[PDB]
């Protein structure tokens, strides 16, 4: 780290009116009560009403930026139809340097922390001047908060129990 902090790239309030946002799960929990990760969001329909999205951001802060997102892989289809109302997955998280799309399916798995389902997590750095776009037909995890930073040099990582 030379600089590192947390800001609110897309505030949960007013980012996603047209998708119901507040849904969470019970493994991600706090003192025996359900939750989900602070920095991110789920999105789903407005009473089973999915429109598909295009959104973007580019830097004004003039510092480097660190961004995270995810891609939904349900363990069953009834969720997928019920939430998002497409068997089609097509997402496109795009930049100048980086760009990648996603089109997954159901893929059943064993219970792991009482979960079969999966969300594969995906991330990138994003510099000043460059723009990012998200496009999607659902099956997303979005940024609520994002990590502002400068670079650092020479510090690192330890494993230790002492």
């Amino acid at each position: 780290v030379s600089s590192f902090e947390r800001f609110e790239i897309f505030p949960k309030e007013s980012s996603w009116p047209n998708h119901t946002t507040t849904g969470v799960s019970a493994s991600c929990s706090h003192n025996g009560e359900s939750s989900f990760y602070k920095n991110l969001l789920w999105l789903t329909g407005k009473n089973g009403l999915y429109p598909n999205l295009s959104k973007s951001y580019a830097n004004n802060k003039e510092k480097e930026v660190l961004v995270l997102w995810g891609v939904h892989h349900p363990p069953n289809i009834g969720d997928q139809r019920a939430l998002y109302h497409t068997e089609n997955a097509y997402v496109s998280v795009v930049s100048s340097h980086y760009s990648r799309k996603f089109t997954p399916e159901i893929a059943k798995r064993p219970k792991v922390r009482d979960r079969e389902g999966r969300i594969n997590y995906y991330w990138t750095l994003l510099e000043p001047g460059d723009t990012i776009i998200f496009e999607a037909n659902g099956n997303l995890i979005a940024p609520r908060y994002a990590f502002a930073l400068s670079r650092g040099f020479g510090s690192g990582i330890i494993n230790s129990n002492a």
Partner: single-chain antibody
Amino acid sequence: EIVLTQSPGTLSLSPGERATLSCRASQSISGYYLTWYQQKPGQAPRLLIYGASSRATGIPDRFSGSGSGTDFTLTISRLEPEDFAVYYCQQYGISPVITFGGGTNVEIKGVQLVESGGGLVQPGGSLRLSCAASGFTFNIYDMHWVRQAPGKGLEWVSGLTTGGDTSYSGSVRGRFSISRENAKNSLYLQMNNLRAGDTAAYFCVRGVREVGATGGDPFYYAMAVWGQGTTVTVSS
């Protein structure tokens, strides 16, 4: 959340007949948003229909509806004297507040919960209820406490998502207080400052699969299942 208005609160019709019922509100309100019930007095509610179209488990095909926005509608293909009953209209606010149509009698002319503690208190006093869970994962679902006077339109007292966003009514709030336990498989409702508006029957109610877990458990934005309720009264 918004005032509903059923249509009619009571009707009288003959065998071999349809029955149109229209529950409509102030504003236009998105249509996978309501669910539709029946009750035999003496019995708890039973679930029938949701989202203005679609049909619950263990069923005929006769109760069927339509409608959208401001006006939601449940129609009926055939009437029978076993259907003698009051049908209800329960909608999940976006202000996360259930609202209730006031029951609709059909007259025909010629796994489980368990509540705990219903009974008497003094008015202005203090008492608690609980519910306890049997045979599922009380982790997941969004829960609701509900009220019902005898042979009257319902009212919704309280509910809470599994993250902690409460919803009460502005009149009921503060005098009651909810609190939840998943490891213990039970729910709690400490209640104080109690007047004759509470002179009625109550229910503990299990609603919505939040987003995710393992199971053979899909979701609606209707209920899952109910409890047998219990009576509560202030009296001196």
